[PDB]
Amino acid sequence: HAGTTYIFSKGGGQITYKWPPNDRPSTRADRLAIGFSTVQKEAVLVRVDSSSGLGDYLELHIHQGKIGVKFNVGTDDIAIEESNAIINDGKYHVVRFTRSGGNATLQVDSWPVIERYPAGRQLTIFNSQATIIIGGKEQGQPFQGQLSGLYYNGLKVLNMAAENDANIAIVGNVRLVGEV
């Protein structure tokens, strides 16, 4: 757990980043990386939502102990997961996700990179990204454990929450881990 770390405990918590109203980005490619440790079978770690009216979203989650990402940029819901192993063993792991149009890439630690190409052709842009929600409380599947080194398209969100950014709001059972 390098860099800034936060712990989510009994009851769940949430760190929310809101882009200012006239600065919501639209992207053709996305980069998401985060460090975590948990023993949960089910939970939503990170979710990026487009503004109201659009269905675009991106969600990093754990289902039956397996870490995966599901996104939608206008066409179908695309899912990619590292279902080989399990990652809810209480140990520290790193997950990297990449998106190029409707194609994706996912890699846990140093295991084999997983490449997913939807058979059905898809739209290409993650339009009007409005919020980055960390903790899964709002999605109804609170994360319990540690998250650190969150990187989303150039934004080091956890550092921003620790550097007390104006566009960040922290709520619930979430604590900033002090440091060495």
C-beta separation of 179 from 59 below 8 A: no
Report the candidate in 131, 162, 146 with the shortest Cα–Cα distance to residue 40: 146
Owner of token pair 């949960």: 40
Return the ∠ at Cα 40 (arms to 103 and 177), rounded to 5°.
Answer: 95
Q: Where are the domains of the chain?
A: 1-180
Q: What is the 3-state secondary structure (H, E, C) of the chain?
A: CCCCEEEEEEEEEEEEEECCHHHCCCECEEEEEEEEECCCCCEEEEEEEECCCCCCEEEEEEECCEEEEEEECCCCCEEEECCCCCCCCCCCEEEEEEEECCEEEEEECCCCCEEECCCCCCCCCECCEEEEEECCCCCCCCCCEEEEEEEECCECHHHHHHCCCCCEEEEEEEEECCCC
How distant is the alpha carbon of residue 44 from its chain centre?
8
Q: Which fold has domain 1-180?
A: Jelly Rolls (2.60.120)
Q: Mark the binding-site residues for Ca(2+), compressed into ranges.
A: 56, 73, 125, 127
Structural contact between residues 128 and 51, judged by C-beta atoms closer than 8 angstroms: yes
How many Å is the maximal CA-CA distance in the chain?
A: 49
Token digits of residue 47: 């979710």
135 CA to centre of own chain: 9
Residues annotated within the binding site are: 56, 73, 125, 127
- Cβ partners under 8 Å of residue 178, min gap 6: none
Find, among 143, 96, 138, the residue nearest to 115 by Cα: 96
**Resolution of the model in angstroms:** 2.6
Indicate which technique resolved this structure: X-ray
Two structure tokens written together for 19: 């882009």
Rounded to whole angstroms, the Cα distance separating 129 from 24 reads 5
Residue 14, beta-bridge partner list? 171
CA distances for 15 relative to 47, 95, 103, 169, angstroms: 11, 19, 28, 6
